[PDB]
Structure formats: structure tokens, C-alpha cells
Amino acid sequence: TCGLVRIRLARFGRKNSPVYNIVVANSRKARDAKPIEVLGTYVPVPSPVTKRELKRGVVPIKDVKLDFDRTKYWIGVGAQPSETVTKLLRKAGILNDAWATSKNSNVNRKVVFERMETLE
Amino acid sequence: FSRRRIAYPFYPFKKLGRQHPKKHDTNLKTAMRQFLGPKNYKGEYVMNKYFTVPTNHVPNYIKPDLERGQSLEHPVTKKPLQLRYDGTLGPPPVENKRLQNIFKDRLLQPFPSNPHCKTNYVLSPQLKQSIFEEITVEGLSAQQVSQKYGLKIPRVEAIVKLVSVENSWNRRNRVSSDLKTMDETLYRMFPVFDSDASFKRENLSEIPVPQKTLASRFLTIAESEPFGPVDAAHVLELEPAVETLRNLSTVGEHSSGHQQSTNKNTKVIYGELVEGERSQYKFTNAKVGKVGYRYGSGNRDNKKDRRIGFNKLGQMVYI
Amino acid sequence: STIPKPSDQVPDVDAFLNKIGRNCNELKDTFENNWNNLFQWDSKILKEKGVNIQQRKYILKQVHNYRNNRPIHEIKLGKKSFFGGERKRKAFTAKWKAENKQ
Amino acid sequence: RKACRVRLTNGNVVSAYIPGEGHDAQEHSIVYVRGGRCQDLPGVKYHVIRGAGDLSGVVNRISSRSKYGAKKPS
Amino acid sequence: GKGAAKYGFKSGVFPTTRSILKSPTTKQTDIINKVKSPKPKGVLGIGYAKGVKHPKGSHRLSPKVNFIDVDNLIAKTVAEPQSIKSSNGSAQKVRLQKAELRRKFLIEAFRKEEARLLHKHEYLQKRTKELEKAKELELEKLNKEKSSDLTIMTLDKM
Amino acid sequence: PRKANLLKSLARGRVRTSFNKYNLFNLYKKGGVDLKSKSLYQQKWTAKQETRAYHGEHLTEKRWQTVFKPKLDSVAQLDASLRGGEIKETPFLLQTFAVLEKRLDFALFRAMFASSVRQARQFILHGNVRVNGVKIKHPSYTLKPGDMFSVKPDKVLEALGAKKPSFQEALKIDKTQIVLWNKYVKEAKTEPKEVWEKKLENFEKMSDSNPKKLQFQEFLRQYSLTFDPKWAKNLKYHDPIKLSELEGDEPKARKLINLPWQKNYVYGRQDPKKPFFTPWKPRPFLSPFAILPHHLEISFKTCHAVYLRDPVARPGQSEVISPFDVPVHERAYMYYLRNGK
RNA sequence: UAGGUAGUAGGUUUAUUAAGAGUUAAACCUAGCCAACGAUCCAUAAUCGAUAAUGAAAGUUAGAACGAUCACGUUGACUCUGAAAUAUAGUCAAUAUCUAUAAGAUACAGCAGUGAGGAAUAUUGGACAAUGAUCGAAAGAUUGAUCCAGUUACUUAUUAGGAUGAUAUAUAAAUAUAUAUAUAUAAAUUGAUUAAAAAUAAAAUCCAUAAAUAAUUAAAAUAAUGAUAUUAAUUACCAUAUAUUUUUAUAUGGAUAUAUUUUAAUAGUCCUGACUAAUAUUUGUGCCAGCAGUCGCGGUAACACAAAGAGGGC
Ligand SMILES: [K+]
Ligand SMILES: [K+]
Ligand SMILES: [K+]
Ligand SMILES: [Mg+2]
Ligand SMILES: [Mg+2]
Ligand SMILES: [Mg+2]
Ligand SMILES: [Mg+2]
Ligand SMILES: [Mg+2]
Ligand SMILES: [Mg+2]
Ligand SMILES: [Mg+2]
Ligand SMILES: [Mg+2]
Ligand SMILES: [Mg+2]
Ligand SMILES: [Mg+2]
Ligand SMILES: [Mg+2]
Ligand SMILES: [Mg+2]
Ligand SMILES: [Mg+2]
Ligand SMILES: [Mg+2]
Ligand SMILES: [Mg+2]
Ligand SMILES: [Mg+2]
Ligand SMILES: [Mg+2]
Ligand SMILES: [Mg+2]
Ligand SMILES: [Mg+2]
Ligand SMILES: [Mg+2]
Ligand SMILES: [Mg+2]
Ligand SMILES: [Mg+2]
Ligand SMILES: [Mg+2]
Ligand SMILES: [Mg+2]
Ligand SMILES: [Mg+2]
Ligand SMILES: [Mg+2]
């Protein structure tokens, strides 16, 4: 990632149980220093599904809390997301395939579920 | 003034006399053998009036004060038996008048020293089926069944949940003979609930007592000014108490008024799932300034009040 | 994933272990010139077979490259300057210019 | 009452009470001094720790051993 | 600690939220009127009174507030490509897509912020008027004479 | 947890959350907590000693102090003023230990799924307890209103049932049972009339507490209540048991035993594979402790229970089951409020 | 520490700066400015929080840990570059050390580690798998940041076994179901001779789980890459089908000889005259030895010293 204003993960939690803040931060500041803004949170550990649920067809869900509107503003002013943050934003539908790279480009992989925006 | 006091029985018992040097007995142990009576070859205490369970829906709770420590009775005639000089058990010289007319409340009081603890009433297997069939089939509301049988709404909802578990168990032949034997024995040990009996009916007007109201505010008003519950509620800045009771009756899953839709206003996105991916991303809209882990929050891990929780799998996890 | 097919430059596992380099030709006996073993064994199996941390990760990176038609040519690890690391270069250079050129 | 004059590592010279029955403290012995005065001895405001440095624990102490540097008998 | 009570028992802090619009906009009429309003003088006044010389080398008046025109901000910051250039190249196409998305995002941010600010002023004005009306009604009920008032001794004439 | 030592000492006379025989005598002979002649500190100390012995003795003092909540919860009956009957004072201070009732181990004991809180902890730790379908193996798990918890049926039967006798122990009871049966067949045959006369008189004093009379009426229908010499003749003498011969061989032993009540199985071992006394019978001295909680709804057929609410105090009653009166709990509350100062 | 100040207080002008100002330099004027509501001087100290401790609270304390800010990188000054540096740069000097003896290099307040000081604070560990950072078009390279592990009860939390249990023999005709089983005989640890206990304590009995063993195996991470790691967890011959909140249950394919891995449980420490919870007594010592937070204890019946028994805390 380049630029002075970057969107990246700041690590929180305990040893062996990492959690992350999605933050807009100055490139030169420490990873866990108070950033410019905290856009959201990322819990990397998927929620465990029970034996029955697995056969039932439930897929483990990773939970992200994100301010969609504020995130779009920072992309607009030239903030540069990190590679992991880029993957998250492409899955949320904020960023598009223009931010994909040659190594992760899923040009040919079947889609089992299409992005669905709901209210809850 | 205080000193160590061996817990000798408050009632009179036969203390130890001269003892052969190798008995090494204690006055507490001999007092217990007198309470228990003789032990048969099968390891039972048939002479003790508490050895066997009641089978008439009347709890057999200890009444040491009323029987003055006389716990022995004939195993079949249930007639008092007391220790005599010969070392044998026989009829008492004078009948105990304190054991023939016992108050109704005391019969349900398990602990002599605590009259504020009483056993609950067991619901008959019929009332449970009736409640189950009314909420599920007839479609009555928990508020109606609660006001009909005099049972609190949470208890009504629990009966429906438990009877459903008994149907699945009876539908798969999982209730064994031993379970049936145990259930019946325990049923015949407790007083059965009678919806008609007014005293047995549970109070249905109870509300949690808030903390702001727990204080005592007093107002000096004109001598003939009316002041009522609604006026008091305005003074205490709380909803009327009747409203609280009504809102607490619409909480049951089968109760009327149960509603939950004002929260379905949070934008959620479910990320695209591709073949080979082991997990799906779920995004929930949040607001900057509320979302995120705060910086410089108090670490409580090394403090006695460290937060401990449980995950979906039941495993202990630090919060 | 799936088993790629041998090519002309990389006919067998031994040729594969020689092109990638980084002293990976010393594992020719671990694989036994079995093409399928190279493209089926994951890190857990390689760790049980005595491959050290650095080599097994490097092999798996080159196996992924081969599966995707990307070059597997050896890339060398970085090395410090002849005159030493930056933090010890001023001292080293001063002592190397007073013992070579005086 | 057995006492001892001690020069602390900070240069302060103090008078420390030696607790317990019997002690092997001599001149030049390394001792560790803690707070606590001897009430009946005026000017003795400190205690030496039994079982630390060159001062051994009380010989044959059975009760309150931790207060007299006595290890647990097997 | 005890200090957390003042902030809803929230432990730790967040960075101060930045303002998308760093100055008032040209559509916030209410603010524009306030600055134009004549500055008071006297005990609670602000500024140099007529005839009072201001310090030599200093500006007598305060610098004029800079109001942002969101239309002009959008035109200068995220201006559109003047020509429909031929993006046949793979990298040119990616750059075109990224530029389009960034422009869409920042234009929506500036117009949503201005709308929010204007909508917030209207809501406050409506809320205040309601509160004022409710206060008058409440006070009127308090001043309403009840029958119990007959039992309160009075000396109105004196 | 705190190690369990001398929990059932008769000299100390502390009452525990258990159905143990020794714990019943301590409760029987206690006769209340003595608070007379004691200073305020001595009264508080005594109250603490007794209450903690019963309410969560396994918890360390320092842990309990953190768990202890100064806030107690009561309920207000909004119809009391609309009744007219003499109102009763709410025992607020009997809620001092209510915070413990939501623990899973305590909930099991109150549901009578375990014979003591100590046993409840072991049931949870050994993987026999589920809450809302999920196996919970931490005794300190806190239940919320509406939660359902279940215990494996075999564990609940082993806790509420009699102890399984060992083969050797149960083989000596059968030997004595055969000897005392051959004595009843020798007295019935030598003088049948007197035995039957005594038998009829015993059935008059049954009081209906003894269901044996109901069963006996059936037997009189299986053969006016007039004597029958065929009865004495029908009676047969069982064969003696040589403990040595059938020692270590249970199938042999359970084929040489055939009594009118116990047929082809050793005493208490009708099914030696089950973990309790077979046929299943209630544990001794179960009646004094069998208390139905007001805050749980129990289904004993399935060994399921629902946590309805946290125990609350109401006029004239506290749902917190305690063997001690309000004055004792008041002193205990005073002690913990100030951390024992 | 009672007087302090002399660019000191103010005015005017120029230089310098992106920029005000005795901010610096230069010139010329006015006689001011601070101060017993504490000036000037001296000493001490990194500061603070939605952090920690304590209290009913106002507050008080800390400033390790988390986070914010400042200052410094052996010491002093100066200069260069730059938007910004008296830079952990350069220059000169000071102190110390070193080797190559040069107008030389180094300065561990980066990590690990050593000596010293001290009552007292750890590995000369693993990995770039994760999150970041730098370089590169990319492939990738680097990273003592960081992530893990090690050491250390320094702190917190969980677990660290439940039910039953006061003796043993002999004993008893020769299935309408008995039943308060009853007799003898021996044995019975410390204390004590009864409200003097130790003690349901022990052993024994019943039933478990952990660990082990076997199989299985997530998740941290995916396009791929896992240091941690001999992963957590689960299952108890493995697989499969059906029914089956959970869960349960049946039946099946392969697997061993009708049954199917094994199986536990050794806490310390202080105290018992009053404050202050500790009644079951006893021995030694004799104002000695010693105890002691306070009052005090000890001179031959010591509830206080040193112990045994018993007891109270944690
Ligand atoms: K001063
Ligand atoms: K890395
Ligand atoms: K102890
Ligand atoms: Mg006392
Ligand atoms: Mg100056
Ligand atoms: Mg000037
Ligand atoms: Mg000048
Ligand atoms: Mg300093
Ligand atoms: Mg402070
Ligand atoms: Mg300070
Ligand atoms: Mg530090
Ligand atoms: Mg510096
Ligand atoms: Mg310096
Ligand atoms: Mg320098
Ligand atoms: Mg240094
Ligand atoms: Mg270091
Ligand atoms: Mg030292
Ligand atoms: Mg330390
Ligand atoms: Mg070391
Ligand atoms: Mg390294
Ligand atoms: Mg003796
Ligand atoms: Mg295991
Ligand atoms: Mg990598
Ligand atoms: Mg993997
Ligand atoms: Mg002592
Ligand atoms: Mg003496
Ligand atoms: Mg003392
Ligand atoms: Mg003593
Ligand atoms: Mg002792």
C-alpha cells in the first residue's frame, strides 16, 4: 500500500485471540496507535456451526461491522486500503474488481451465493 | 462474649454413662444413633419417621421442635415409639399434643427455623396437558391461560416447552421404567396445585421494583387536592405501575401483544460466496464514533473482576 | 488441488528440485522422484518427513507457481553488502580502506 | 535482649533486634534488616530477618517457622 | 475509573470525528444571516466602537468567514474527464474504473453532508418550536385554577 | 474450589446443601442460630459461619466477596391494597445469597437432579449437563430467565436412588433373607391359624400409607376371609446359600435365589449394569430435603428444567431456599457489605 | 529566599521570517514592569486520561501496565539538507574504549545478553504464518516492528472427586409377598469417665471424569503460504443409512474375541488473654528463656513464652 492515508487493520484482543479495528491511519504511525478514524471491526475467527447446521447447509460466518458511508468518503479522498482491507471491501461490494490483483483474481470460480443486501 | 460450642442437641437425649475404655464413643454419636434408631441387616433405618418418602402428596418435613427429638415410629402403624430404660422402644407415656394439630403452613415449611421458605405446588399431569393443548391447538394466549389457572406467564410458557420435550421422549420410547418410577414417587411427595383453590393461586400483579422509586419522596399539597397513582408516576418520571404490569404480560412467546419489528432497520450485506470458500462475510452498517475497540480502555485481566463469558459452543472465553 | 502435468523443462521431481534451488536438491530422497507426492503432500506431511520450515514453505510456493503456469526459477535470498550492513558499514569500510589501499 | 548494630548498604547505621532463641550473628556477618521496633528497647527500631544472609534460622523451631527462617521438617 | 461515568461508562477513547465539510456551506442560510447581522456594541459588544482607533498594523474587523459552495468544491476536486479518452489498455481501463468509483463516492459524500447539515437545522427549529409550545401548554395547566385551591389561604388584597 | 473437609462434622453442626444422613442430623438437632450475649462482631461472624456453610461453601471467601452483590431484588404486588387482608413484611435480606442461585451447579441441586451442590459440580464437569442443547462443563455458568437445562437420566437416578450394593454385600443380605423366610414357613406350618390371624390383624393398621394392603386384597382374591390349610401347605422352604460356593459367580448366585419378592436376582442388583440400586428405589432420608423450587419448572420424566426467573422476595416469602431465618441472613449481609470490617 | 528587573516595561524604525512580537541583531526615545492573593531565588519532579488504587462521596494516591503529549538517544555548541532537524546526520570539542594509527572507528535509553548497583524484575528462543512498515513494474527481498514460545505464583481466573460409610464372625425348617430379625462370641487407635472429644475422619463399598492410548481434527488464511504445534476440540472399534431442539435410537458396511482401550486423586501457612473468629485439656520454663500492632505476658495452677492435644482463619 502507498500514500500517507491508508485503511488497514489495527490489532486488538489477546494472545491467540486476535481482533481488529478497521482504521484510517497515517502510514508512519504505529500499527496500534490511535488512528485518524475507526471505520469498523473485523473478527477473523468464523462462527462455529453445529453438526446439524453443517448438514443443513449453514456456512460459517465472519462478522464485520463497518460504516459504509464513511468508508466511501475516505476512498474518495484517495485513502489507500491494505490488501486485507481491500479483500473485505470487495466482498462488501464497496470496491469492485478493479482493485483485484493477478494472484487473487477469481476470474473462473463458480458463485454459490450472490451478494445480498438486506435489513436486520 | 463468645466461645466454641459443640452442637449438642437442643432436645433431651440419653447421655453416655461410664464407658468401657475401648469404646471411644462421643455424646454426639450416641445422640445420632438415638435419632436414627436400630440399623437392620439391610443397612436401613426403618424406625426413623423420615427414612421413607411420603406417598400422599403431603411432605414429611422434619419437626424436631414439635416432637422434642422423638423421631422414631413404628414402620407400619406409624405409632410413636420412644427409648426406655431397658434399651428398647415402646409407646410414649403421654401423647404429644403438638404433633396432632399442625398448622397448614408448617406442613409446607421444610426448615424449622425459616418460616419464609415454603415448597412449591406440583402441577398435575392433566393440567399440564390442558395448558399445552390450549396454547398450541386452541390458540389461547398465555395471558388468558395465566389468568384462568392462576399461574404466572413464565411458568405457563415453561410448561408448554417442557411438555413438548416429554412428547418427543414418549414418541421415541426414551422414558424408561426407572424414570417413570422416579417421576411418580416425586409427584406423590408434593402438594398438588389446585387452580380453583384461591390460596394456592399465584399472585399475578407482581412487578419488578425499580431503584429510582425505592427512595421516599414526599409532597405537601393542598388538604383537599387529589393525588393518585398516575400523578405519582409523573412525579417519579416513570410509566404508571399498571402499564408496567401490562407490558410484562405481553412478553411471553405465546402471549398477546408480543411484537419485535422496530429493530429491522440495520443495513446488512452478505458477501458473495464462491466455491471453495470455507466462510461467508457478513457486514453490518455502523457509525464512526460508536463502532470499534476503544483505545486506552481499562485492562481488567489482572483484576478480580476480569470479564469471563461463554461462546456458542459453551467454552469459557475471556471477554 | 489437481496434479499438473510434467513438462519438457521440468520432466521429473528431481529437475523441479534443481530449478527452484535454495539447496532443495537435497530433498530428492524425501520425494523419491514421485510426481504425485510433490503435488499432494501439504505442509503437515512435509513436516513429518523432516523438511525444515523454510524449505517446505518454499517448495509449496513453487508448487503453486507450477500449477498456475508461473515461472519457478530460483530467486535468491537477500545478502548483506560486501562492506557489511548499513549499521556496521562505516566501521568496516574504514578498516578495509586502511588494510587494502593504505 | 540480643541486639546488633548494623551498617546498611545505604550508609545508615541502625540497631536491629535479633528475634528467636539463640543466634549465630557475629561481627562482619551479612544480615538483612526489616522494619519493626523492639518496644521495650528504646532506639532499636528494626529487626534482622532470620534465615537470610549469614543469620541462620532458629534451631529446632516448630511453630511459626516462616517467621524464624525454619524449613519444614520432612 | 470514576471519570468514565461522564461518558456513559465507556472505557477508552476514539479519535475525534473529522468533518467532511470543513466550513459552512453557501446553503446554510441561517449561518449566513448571523454573520451578516450587525455586531453589538457596549457592555456585551464585540468590536471597536466608532471613534476608537484600533491598533496600528491590525485589522479592525474579523476576517470574513469562508463559505463553501459544494457545486464548486465538486467541480474543482473531482472534475470529470474532459474527453472520453480511448482506454484500450488494461491498466488504463483499471484506472478509469477506479477514477469513476472514487468520483462517485466523494460526490455522494459532499452532497449527503450538506443535506444532513440543512436537515439538522430544520429539525432543531421544528423541535424547539414544539418544546416552546409544550412549555406554554404545561404552564397554562399549572396556572389553571383547581377546586383544591379554595383550601389554600390567601391575602390577595394585601 | 475449596477442598471438602469435615463438611458433615457433628460437633460443628453445620448444615450443607446435601441429602447426606449426617447432614440431616445436624439440621435436625440445630435448633436455630444462637445470637444472644454476642457482640456485634461475634453475631456477624456466627451468621457468616452458618450461612456460608450452606450457601456456596465450595467458593473461596475472596471469590464470594467479588460475586456478592449489595443490591437485592424484590417484587411489588399491585393488588395488595385491593385485597384487605393483613399484609406481610417482605423478607428482603433473605436475598443476600440469591446471586448464587443462577449458577448451573446450584440450579441442578434445586431441581433435585443431584444430591448436593458438590455432586452437581461433578455432573457438570464430567459432561452430563446440557443448557439449551449445548453441553456446558463449567459449574460457574450463569443461567438466564427462560434457559432450559437437562441432565443425563442415569446420573439423576443415581443421585436420587439408593446405593447399589456390591455382590458380596448383597449376597450376605440374601443369606439372611432366606433364613428369615424359612422361619416364616416353619411358624406358618406349625401353627397356621395364629399366623393367619396375626396376618389379618396387621392389615387393619396399615392406614393406607402401606400399599401392601392393597396388594394383599388381590392375593385374597387369588385364592369371607376364612382360614385355608392349603396356604400353609403351599408355602415352601427356600434352599440355604453357601456364600463360599457361589462366591465370585454372580450368574450362578442369581439362579439359586428365588424368593416370593426377589426372584432370580441378588438384592439390589436386578440389573448390575445400571449404576444404582435395582429395582430403583428412592435414596434414604429424601423426604426432609425434597423441596420444590418456586423459580424452576421441573420435568422429572425427562430430567429437564427451565430457569423461570431469578429468585425474588415477596410479602411473607423468599424464593431463596435457606435453613436460616432472616435475622441470621441480616447479620451475614452486614458482614459482607463492609468486607468483614 | 523580600525585594526583583536593566532588553528590563513601553513607544518608533530597519534587518531577519510564510508570519505577530525586545523573538534575535542595530539605532533612537519614554521610565517603566513584577511583588506578602508570594515576586525573584532555591529545591524537587517528565505530564495527563473515558488508565490503575481507594472512599458513601468530595477527594486523595500512582503515573508500572493500555492510550495521549513532551523531552532525550555518552556530553556541549554549531552548520547542512529540508515544508519541518541545533537530527541517534555532519562539523568541532569533551569523556571512555578500540585497531587499521588515521584531521580513524565505536558509545546497546533497538532485541537478546554480561558486569555493576540493589531487597528486587526474564531467553545471548522461534517465525515472517498473521497485522503492519520499507524497497521493487512485477516476481519477490527485508523486518529483535510484530506475532508466538521460554523464564518468573508478580497479578487474575478455572480446575485440583463425588455418593455411601462406625466392627467382625458364628448364628436360625429339613412359594397368598416375608419383614421392627433375634441371639451369642470376639474385637475396639489417641485423649478422656461424659455434654470431651479426635471422628464420617480413616479404611472399605458404589459410580465417574482427567491423563494416557487409539482414531479424528477444526480455526487463526487463503490463490497459496501456519512460527505457535506433539494445535484446540471431539469421539471411544471406524464408516454408512434411517428416524432422531439438543439429543436419542435402530439397522447396517468393514473391524477384534456373544461382547468390544485404559483409568486415577497426600496443602500449605498464620493464629486461639482483650481489641479479634478460636472452652477439651496438658507439659516444660520460672521477670530466665523469650513474646509483643496496641494494652501487656513471664517471679512454680503461664488461656500470652517453648510445645502436645483440640480449635479458628485464609
Ligand atoms: K516563591
Ligand atoms: K510479515
Ligand atoms: K488449618
Ligand atoms: Mg473470641
Ligand atoms: Mg526578554
Ligand atoms: Mg519589532
Ligand atoms: Mg537594542
Ligand atoms: Mg529527574
Ligand atoms: Mg494526579
Ligand atoms: Mg504526580
Ligand atoms: Mg515500560
Ligand atoms: Mg536530539
Ligand atoms: Mg544531545
Ligand atoms: Mg550528532
Ligand atoms: Mg549507553
Ligand atoms: Mg537491552
Ligand atoms: Mg548485587
Ligand atoms: Mg518481580
Ligand atoms: Mg538467567
Ligand atoms: Mg530474528
Ligand atoms: Mg488411653
Ligand atoms: Mg482425554
Ligand atoms: Mg508470506
Ligand atoms: Mg493449511
Ligand atoms: Mg509467636
Ligand atoms: Mg506451668
Ligand atoms: Mg496472642
Ligand atoms: Mg503459645
Ligand atoms: Mg497440634
From Swiss-Prot, chain B:
Species annotation: Saccharomyces cerevisiae (strain ATCC 204508 / S288c)
Q: Output the Gene Ontology terms for molecular function.
A: structural constituent of ribosome
Quote the subcellular location field of this record: Mitochondrion
Per the record, its GO cellular-component terms are:
mitochondrial inner membrane; mitochondrial small ribosomal subunit; mitochondrion
Query: What does the subunit section of this Swiss-Prot or TrEMBL entry state?
Result: Component of the mitochondrial small ribosomal subunit (mt-SSU). Mature yeast 74S mitochondrial ribosomes consist of a small (37S) and a large (54S) subunit. The 37S small subunit contains a 15S ribosomal RNA (15S mt-rRNA) and 34 different proteins. The 54S large subunit contains a 21S rRNA (21S mt-rRNA) and 46 different proteins.
Name the Pfam families on file: Bot1p
Query: Which cysteines bridge via disulfide bonds?
Result: none
What are the recorded Gene Ontology BP terms? mitochondrial translation
User: Predominant location of this chain?
Assistant: mitochondrion
Q: Supply the gene name.
A: MRPS35
**Leader sequence segment:** none
Q: Which InterPro entries match?
A: Ribosomal_mS45
Q: Return the PANTHER family for the record.
A: 37S RIBOSOMAL PROTEIN S35, MITOCHONDRIAL, SMALL RIBOSOMAL SUBUNIT PROTEIN MS45
Any idea what this protein is called?
Answer: Small ribosomal subunit protein mS45
Q: What does this protein do?
A: Component of the mitochondrial ribosome (mitoribosome), a dedicated translation machinery responsible for the synthesis of mitochondrial genome-encoded proteins, including at least some of the essential transmembrane subunits of the mitochondrial respiratory chain. The mitoribosomes are attached to the mitochondrial inner membrane and translation products are cotranslationally integrated into the membrane.
UniProtKB/Swiss-Prot annotation, chain C:
Q: What is its main location?
A: mitochondrion
Q: Which cysteines are joined by disulfide bonds?
A: none
Q: Which of UniProt's keywords are assigned here?
A: Mitochondrion, Ribonucleoprotein, Ribosomal protein, Transit peptide
Q: What are the subcellular locations of this protein?
A: Mitochondrion
GO cellular component labels: mitochondrial inner membrane; mitochondrial small ribosomal subunit; mitochondrion
Instruction: List GO BP terms, alphabetically.
Output: mitochondrial translation
- GO terms, molecular function: structural constituent of ribosome
Assembly and partners? Answer: Component of the mitochondrial small ribosomal subunit (mt-SSU). Mature yeast 74S mitochondrial ribosomes consist of a small (37S) and a large (54S) subunit. The 37S small subunit contains a 15S ribosomal RNA (15S mt-rRNA) and 34 different proteins. The 54S large subunit contains a 21S rRNA (21S mt-rRNA) and 46 different proteins.
The family assignment reads: Belongs to the mitochondrion-specific ribosomal protein mS41 family.
This molecule's function is given as: Component of the mitochondrial ribosome (mitoribosome), a dedicated translation machinery responsible for the synthesis of mitochondrial genome-encoded proteins, including at least some of the essential transmembrane subunits of the mitochondrial respiratory chain. The mitoribosomes are attached to the mitochondrial inner membrane and translation products are cotranslationally integrated into the membrane. mS41 is involved in telomere length regulation and required for survival upon exposure to K1 killer toxin.
Miscellaneous field:
Present with 2630 molecules/cell in log phase SD medium.
Q: What is this protein called?
A: Small ribosomal subunit protein mS41
Curated annotation (Swiss-Prot), chain D:
Q: Does the keyword Transmembrane apply?
A: no
Q: Which GO terms describe its cellular component?
A: mitochondrial inner membrane; mitochondrial small ribosomal subunit; mitochondrion; ribosome
Q: Which domain of life is it from?
A: Eukaryota
GO MF annotations, alphabetized: structural constituent of ribosome
Is Ligase given among the entry's keywords? Answer: no
Q: Name one GO biological process term.
A: mitochondrial translation
How does the annotation summarize its subunit structure?
Answer: Component of the mitochondrial small ribosomal subunit (mt-SSU). Mature yeast 74S mitochondrial ribosomes consist of a small (37S) and a large (54S) subunit. The 37S small subunit contains a 15S ribosomal RNA (15S mt-rRNA) and 34 different proteins. The 54S large subunit contains a 21S rRNA (21S mt-rRNA) and 46 different proteins. uS12m forms part of the decoding center of the mt-SSU.
Function, as annotated, reads: Component of the mitochondrial ribosome (mitoribosome), a dedicated translation machinery responsible for the synthesis of mitochondrial genome-encoded proteins, including at least some of the essential transmembrane subunits of the mitochondrial respiratory chain. The mitoribosomes are attached to the mitochondrial inner membrane and translation products are cotranslationally integrated into the membrane. uS12m is required for respiratory growth.
Question: What is the recorded name of this protein?
Answer: Small ribosomal subunit protein uS12m
- Which species expresses this protein natively? Saccharomyces cerevisiae (strain ATCC 204508 / S288c)
Section covered of the full-length record: 78 to 151 of 153
Swiss-Prot record, chain F:
**Subcellular localization(s) per the UniProt record:** Mitochondrion
Q: Does the keyword Cell membrane apply?
A: no
| Effect recorded for R110K | In MNA6-1; causes temperature-dependent loss of the 15S rRNA
GO biological process per UniProt: mitochondrial translation; ribosomal small subunit biogenesis
Q: Name one GO molecular function term.
A: structural constituent of ribosome
Gene3D superfamilies referenced in this protein's UniProt entry, alphabetically = RNA-binding S4 domain
Mutation: P293L; reported impact is:
In MNA6-2; causes temperature-dependent loss of the 15S rRNA
Q: What is the effect of changing L108F?
A: In MNA6-3; causes temperature-dependent loss of the 15S rRNA
Q: Where is the S4 RNA-binding domain?
A: 102-171
Keywords in alphabetical order: Mitochondrion, Ribonucleoprotein, Ribosomal protein, RNA-binding, rRNA-binding
Task: Tell me the domain of life.
Answer: Eukaryota
GO terms for cellular component: mitochondrial inner membrane; mitochondrial small ribosomal subunit; mitochondrion
Give the function comment from the record: Component of the mitochondrial ribosome (mitoribosome), a dedicated translation machinery responsible for the synthesis of mitochondrial genome-encoded proteins, including at least some of the essential transmembrane subunits of the mitochondrial respiratory chain. The mitoribosomes are attached to the mitochondrial inner membrane and translation products are cotranslationally integrated into the membrane.
Q: Which family does it belong to?
A: Belongs to the universal ribosomal protein uS4 family.
**Miscellaneous information on this protein:** Present with 3270 molecules/cell in log phase SD medium.
Task: Please report the name of this protein according to its UniProt entry.
Answer: Small ribosomal subunit protein uS4m
Task: Give the organism the record lists.
Answer: Saccharomyces cerevisiae (strain ATCC 204508 / S288c) (Baker's yeast)
